[PDB]
Amino acid sequence: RHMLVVAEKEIAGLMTPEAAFEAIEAVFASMARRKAYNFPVVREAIGHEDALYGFKGGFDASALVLGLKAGGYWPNNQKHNLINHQSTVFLFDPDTGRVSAAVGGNLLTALRTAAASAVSIKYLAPKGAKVLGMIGAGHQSAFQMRAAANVHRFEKVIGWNPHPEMLSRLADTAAELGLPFEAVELDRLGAEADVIVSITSSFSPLLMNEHVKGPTHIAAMGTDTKGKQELDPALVARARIFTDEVAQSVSIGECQHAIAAGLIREDQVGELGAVVAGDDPGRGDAEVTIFDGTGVGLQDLAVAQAVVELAKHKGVAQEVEI
Amino acid sequence: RHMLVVAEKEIAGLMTPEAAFEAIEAVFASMARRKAYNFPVVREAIGHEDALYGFKGGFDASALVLGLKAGGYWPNNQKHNLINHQSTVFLFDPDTGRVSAAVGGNLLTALRTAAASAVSIKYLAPKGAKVLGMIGAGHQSAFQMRAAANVHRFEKVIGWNPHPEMLSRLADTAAELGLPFEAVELDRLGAEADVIVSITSSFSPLLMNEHVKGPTHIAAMGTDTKGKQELDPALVARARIFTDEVAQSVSIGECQHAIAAGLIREDQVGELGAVVAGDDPGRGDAEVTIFDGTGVGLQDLAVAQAVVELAKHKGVAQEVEI
Numbered sequence: 356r357h358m359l360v361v362a363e364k365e366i367a368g369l370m371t372p373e374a375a376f377e378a379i380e381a382v383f384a385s386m387a388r389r390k391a392y393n394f395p396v397v398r399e400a401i402g403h404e405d406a407l408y409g410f411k412g413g414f415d416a417s418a419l420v421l422g423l424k425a426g427g428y429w430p431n432n433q434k435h436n437l438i439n440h441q442s443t444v445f446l447f448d449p450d451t452g453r454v455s456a457a458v459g460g461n462l463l464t465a466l467r468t469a470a471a472s473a474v475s476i477k478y479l480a481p482k483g484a485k486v487l488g489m490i491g492a493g494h495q496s497a498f499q500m501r502a503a504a505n506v507h508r509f510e511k512v513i514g515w516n517p518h519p520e521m522l523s524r525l526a527d528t529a530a531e532l533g534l535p536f537e538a539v540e541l542d543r544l545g546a547e548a549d550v551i552v553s554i555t556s557s558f559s560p561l562l563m564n565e566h567v568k569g570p571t572h573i574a575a576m577g578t579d580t581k582g583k584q585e586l587d588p589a590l591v592a593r594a595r596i597f598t599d600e601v602a603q604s605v606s607i608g609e610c611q612h613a614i615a616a617g618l619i620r621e622d623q624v625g626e627l628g629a630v631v632a633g634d635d636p637g638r639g640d641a642e643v644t645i646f647d648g649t650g651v652g653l654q655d656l657a658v659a660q661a662v663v664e665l666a667k668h669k670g671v672a673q674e675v676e677i
Numbered sequence: 678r679h680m681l682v683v684a685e686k687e688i689a690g691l692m693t694p695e696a697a698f699e700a701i702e703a704v705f706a707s708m709a710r711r712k713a714y715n716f717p718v719v720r721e722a723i724g725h726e727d728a729l730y731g732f733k734g735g736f737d738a739s740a741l742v743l744g745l746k747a748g749g750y751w752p753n754n755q756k757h758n759l760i761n762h763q764s765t766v767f768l769f770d771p772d773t774g775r776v777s778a779a780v781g782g783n784l785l786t787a788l789r790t791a792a793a794s795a796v797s798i799k800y801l802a803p804k805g806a807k808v809l810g811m812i813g814a815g816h817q818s819a820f821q822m823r824a825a826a827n828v829h830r831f832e833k834v835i836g837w838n839p840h841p842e843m844l845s846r847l848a849d850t851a852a853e854l855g856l857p858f859e860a861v862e863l864d865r866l867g868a869e870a871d872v873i874v875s876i877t878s879s880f881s882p883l884l885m886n887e888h889v890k891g892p893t894h895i896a897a898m899g900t901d902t903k904g905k906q907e908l909d910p911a912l913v914a915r916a917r918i919f920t921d922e923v924a925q926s927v928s929i930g931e932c933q934h935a936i937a938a939g940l941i942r943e944d945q946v947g948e949l950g951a952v953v954a955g956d957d958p959g960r961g962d963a964e965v966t967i968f969d970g971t972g973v974g975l976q977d978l979a980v981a982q983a984v985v986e987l988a989k990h991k992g993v994a995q996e997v998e999i
């Protein structure tokens with residue numbers, strides 16, 4: 356009996372935005388139909404090298420995926436010539452309990468996060484969305500724009516960056532996709548962008564309520580810890596809200612600040628997967644929609660189960676006896 | 678950069694009861710000195726194949742060992758020609774966060790469980806213990822007897838089992854250890870066994886309060902789940918109690934019943950590691966001592982780290998790129 360290992364350097368040549376979209380769109384519908392759930396997250400500051408280490412487990416009864424993503428954040432990894440984020444996904448056989456696969460989760464995390472916002476664009480973007488708005492130009496921004504253009508045909512890409520130095524990262528990605536780009540200010544972005552994808556490590560409201568005008572869908576992907584914030588709580592409180600895990604959205608998600616101040620209800624925080632499964636009308640007659648993407652382990656298990664199938668069909672899945 | 682893999686079939690040729698004893702003894706001391714700790718345990722009934730699946734993580738700052746054991750219990754694994762207990766230890770580099778090793782955990786679990794019971798024997802057994810009492814003849818009962826005979830020199834082994842046909846497993850291993858065996862009922866076992874080791878999956882009190890007579894150390898290893906029970910809560914109430922994790926002992930351990938009945942309070946539950954680290958005198962003049970072995974992830978981590986060290990020396994550690 357052997358287990359499969361898919362090295363990190365193989366993920367780029369195997370995964371695609373289409374393959375990432377299929378896995379995440381499917382795992383959203385399973386969570387809505389209560390065929391899949393996330394385990395309680397373990398998150399520990401081990402008190403050594405300032406590390407944050409933990410596990411994100413889950414089980415998908417619809418796709419028979421069982422396992423976890425283990426790892427975290429090592430801020431001092433520069434001395435090792437390594438990136439700060441280090442994670443690994445372990446898959447187990449749901450029928451027997453044996454380990455089945457082990458895949459690096461660094462690039463997979465960026466792809467499933469980009470695929471998550473792409474699902475919210477497919478099911479919540481306004482009719483005939485013209486301009487794509489990008490708030491932030493970090494490492495994740497290139498994956499977010501590529502996943503957005505893969506699911507919706509855009510005509511213009513406008514972008515704003517809290518740090519104007521790396522504004523060129525959005526322009527290179529927009530030119531890569533064959534779309535024009537224009538660096539705009541935050542007030543003009545909310546008025547022209549029909550779809551807005553924010554992906555910053557911000558601790559204060561960036562996109563204000565008076566900025567957003569007209570039908571607009573917002574993919575709030577930045578806030579994933581207690582304390583972070585990207586949107587004006589007044590802006591969150593006028594939009595129909597969808598998320599991946601309601602418990603995480605009201606605690607460490609973008610909605611954490613509006614539910615605490617009593618600006619929105621907890622029972623009004625919808626599930627994006629409920630729209631994919633057809634149980635939720637979706638955008639409906641709301642002018643502004645917000646997808647509060649917080650990140651769940653089932654997203655990491657779905658794309659990991661996809662790369663192991665693509666790897667062994669390609670011939671790059673390492674067979675290991677264990 | 679790469680990842681090591683130690684197959685399950687190599688564990689037997691690498692681990693010895695003495696090597697497992699030295700690892701677990703040191704881990705008990707590190708926990709008492711607060712140089713190591715266990716992460717919050719995840720334990721989920723996923724609903725598929727009646728399986729119990731979860732993670733037991735931990736970190737040993739003294740030995741710089743980090744990781745978790747993943748897996749659990751598949752009650753119907755006999756139809757797959759597999760044992761019901763399936764687990765796997767994943768070690769991570771504490772300085773970088775990258776995964777370092779994956780080790781088969783089936784044989785490791787039984788070894789460290791037997792080592793934990795042997796540590797309590799070395800530090801809590803009555804002076805000159807001559808008769809070892811085995812309550813349970815399951816799979817792990819053989820490992821418990823071998824580890825107990827390795828740390829302490831016994832003259833006789835008496836055994837009892839709810840299903841009396843399995844007693845051949847105790848007699849066979851008693852023959853391997855050069856020790857005579859006699860099957861008995863629980864009334865004689867409690868009055869003649871100086872050291873008692875219970876390793877049953879029971880939900881009813883077996884060893885009663887008036888069964889135990891004279892100086893006796895009871896290594897209760899079977900109860901690791903809310904609802905299981907091996908001992909009479911009255912017997913637990915009159916004994917000097919030690920455990921590996923006080924939080925688990927009062928909830929899923931043997932003390933869960935004497936705690937709920939108000940017979941004892943959690944501050945009356947000691948730590949076996951404090952006896953190992955010299956901070957606790959241990960037995961003293963008490964007539965009955967109990968070690969509530971529930972199982973902690975650091976035990977798996979310590980015994981797996983030693984296996985990786987031996988596997989690299991013996992040359993049986995598979996180098997895998999990830």
Ligand SMILES: NC(=O)c1ccc[n+]([C@@H]2O[C@H](COP(=O)([O-])OP(=O)(O)OC[C@H]3O[C@@H](n4cnc5c(N)ncnc54)[C@H](O)[C@@H]3O)[C@@H](O)[C@H]2O)c1
Nearest residue numbers: 468491492493494495517518555556557576577648649650
């Ligand atoms: N929701 C998910 O599933 C998921 C997954 C991965 C990452 N993320 C989140 O995405 C966010 C960015 O990911 P990245 O890796 O692209 O980070 P990154 O640091 O590469 O980009 C940082 C962005 O945050 C902005 N920024 C930095 N400090 C700021 C401050 N003090 N105030 C306002 N803006 C500030 C920078 O201008 C830049 O745009 C992080 O917050 C991360 O947690 C979410």
Ligand SMILES: NC(=O)c1ccc[n+]([C@@H]2O[C@H](COP(=O)([O-])OP(=O)(O)OC[C@H]3O[C@@H](n4cnc5c(N)ncnc54)[C@H](O)[C@@H]3O)[C@@H](O)[C@H]2O)c1
Nearest residue numbers: 790814815816817839876877878879898899901970971972
């Ligand atoms: N504490 C630890 O660190 C640790 C580690 C591993 C296993 N365990 C526990 O050890 C126990 C047995 O381990 P095993 O894998 O050797 O199990 P096993 O099933 O091989 O043997 C189980 C024994 O329990 C007894 N038993 C079974 N059903 C019973 C019932 N209904 N009432 C009373 N007695 C009954 C029988 O004597 C049987 O031999 C399990 O409960 C397991 O959780 C503890």
Ligand SMILES: [Tb+3]
Nearest residue numbers: 725726727753
């Ligand atoms: Tb059943």
Ligand SMILES: [Tb+3]
Nearest residue numbers: 840841842843
């Ligand atoms: Tb028979």
